[PDB]
Amino acid sequence: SSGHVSFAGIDYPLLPLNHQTPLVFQWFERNPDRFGQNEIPIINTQKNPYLNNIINAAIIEKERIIGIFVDGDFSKGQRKALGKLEQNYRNIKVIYNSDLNYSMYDKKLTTIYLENITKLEARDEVLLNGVKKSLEDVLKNPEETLISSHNKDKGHLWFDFYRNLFLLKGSDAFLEAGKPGCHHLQPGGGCIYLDADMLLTDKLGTLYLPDGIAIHVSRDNHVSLENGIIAVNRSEHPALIKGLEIMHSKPYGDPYNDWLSKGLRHYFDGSHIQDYDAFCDFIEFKHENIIMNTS
């Protein structure tokens, strides 16, 4: 209807992400004291001019909301500096991770382990190792959830887990935060999430994505899913909910193959009848006006 793309036996409609679809950048800052107490606490050096990259994108995308999704122990002056950015560029909206409620996506670690123990009493060495070690995991802070444990890391896991959850909320994250001037967002709408290390050279316009989703792929003989661009047309996109179900069902993280990636591949090709390369070709986010990792 806006066309289709077929993959692994299913025809996926190409769906539009129009100007109502906001851009989102994330900055989770472990050491906010490295910035001035009244400065914007986002790196903006010659080498990594990330704030400038974001401002440029906001200027170019004059008809779109630009989100800056942040976390960290910012000072009041830093919060005020972020506020001033919002006044100066009327489409820029700062969203603090503090202000968002993710409890609908959370789960107690005990529940996960019990479910695992129950299944794993019902073929292999892997399983018996799995069973003992999970059993062990339970015995150990009993109120802990996925959120509370990730709340303890201030590293990549903290960033990644919250990026992924944000993407489940999509445009709703702006509404939930109560941001001014967000009347054009579609409730239940998506977002175009971007690494701040990028150059936008001109307007994106409307994107047409298979089932409304696409991801950064890097390509010399090799190809890989990358996490610098994730675009979705709607909140709680089912391919992302798949990743969440995986996180909800598994005791242990896998560092190279994250749950977002695993969920995408599982949703689009649970069987793996097409190779990784074919999946990469299918899902790839490609736009001539974006240059990734300029720095």
Numbering used by the authors: 39 to 160, 166 to 183, 185 to 263, 265 to 340
Give verbatim excerpts from the published study on this entry.
The non-LEE encoded effector protein B (NleB) has GT activity and inhibits NF-κB activation by transferring N-acetyl glucosamine (GlcNAc) to host death domain-containing proteins and to glyceraldehyde 3-phosphate dehydrogenase (GAPDH). The glycosylation target is an arginine residue, which was unexpected because the guanidine group of arginine is nucleophilically poor at physiological pH. The T3SS effectors SseK1 and SseK2 from Salmonella typhimurium SL1344 are NleB orthologs that behave as NleB1-like GTs, although they differ in protein substrate specificity. Here, by using a combination of X-ray crystallography, STD-NMR, enzyme kinetics, molecular dynamics simulations, and in vivo experiments, we show that these enzymes are GT-A fold retaining GTs that most likely follow an SNi mechanism.
SseK2 was solved both in its unliganded form and in complex with UDP and UDP-GlcNAc. For structural analyses, we focus on SseK2 because the data-sets for this protein were obtained at a higher resolution, with three different snapshots of the active site. The C-terminal lid domain is highly flexible in the absence of a ligand. Therefore, the electron density map for this domain was not resolved. In the ground state of SseK2, the C-terminal lid domain is highly flexible, impeding its visualization in the crystal structure. Docking of FADD110-118 was only possible using the SseK2 structure with the C-terminal lid in the open conformation, since the closed lid precludes access to the binding site.
